């Protein structure tokens, strides 16, 4: 239903990330000194309009925001696609994959940047991802 909510279809458990939404959003550490700004289920006020995540140093987009929350194998996931053109001979764009995993007891982390696909992979351990 693409409103920052999703159910586990096997159990009907309703997951909801609306409590993390807001333009102020969050940041994740990037490299030595940089960061990435990110808003959940909406654009981030530090990024260009419509952009849900962007590099701190440049405000260059690594994904357009959306509310299409998905459930797969106990993980909740947002995928912000259509980022800026990345350094790529074949014309790829940056995208951000944001994975919420259960923590029964709340900052995103960048765990990987796959240069092959220009995809930034983030993880966020949160009680919001538990059932
Ligand atoms: Br940066
Ligand atoms: Br949105
Ligand atoms: Br894309
Ligand atoms: Br992790």
From Swiss-Prot:
Post-translation changes: Palmitoylated. Undergoes cysteine S-palmitoylation which promotes interaction with the retromer cargo-selective complex which mediates its retrograde trafficking to the Golgi apparatus.
Subcellular localization(s) per the UniProt record: Golgi apparatus membrane; Endosome membrane
Covalent S-S links between cysteines: 4-41, 47-54, 86-118, 102-130
Limits of the MRH domain: 2-131
Function comment: Mediates the transport of phosphorylated lysosomal enzymes from the Golgi complex and the cell surface to lysosomes. Lysosomal enzymes bearing phosphomannosyl residues bind specifically to mannose-6-phosphate receptors in the Golgi apparatus and the resulting receptor-ligand complex is transported to an acidic prelysosomal compartment where the low pH mediates the dissociation of the complex. The receptor is then recycled back to the Golgi for another round of trafficking through its binding to the retromer. This receptor also binds IGF2.
Notes concerning its domains: Contains 15 repeating units of approximately 147 AA harboring four disulfide bonds each. The most highly conserved region within the repeat consists of a stretch of 13 AA that contains cysteines at both ends.
Oligomer and partners: Binds HA-I and HA-II plasma membrane adapters. Interacts with DPP4; the interaction is direct. Binds GGA1, GGA2 and GGA3. Interacts with the heterotrimeric retromer cargo-selective complex (CSC), formed by VPS26 (VPS26A or VPS26B), VPS29 and VPS35; which is involved in retrograde trafficking of the receptor from endosomes to the Golgi apparatus.
Family: Belongs to the MRL1/IGF2R family.
Name recorded for this polypeptide: Cation-independent mannose-6-phosphate receptor
Gene that encodes the chain: IGF2R
Part of the intact protein present: 1513 to 1647 of 2491
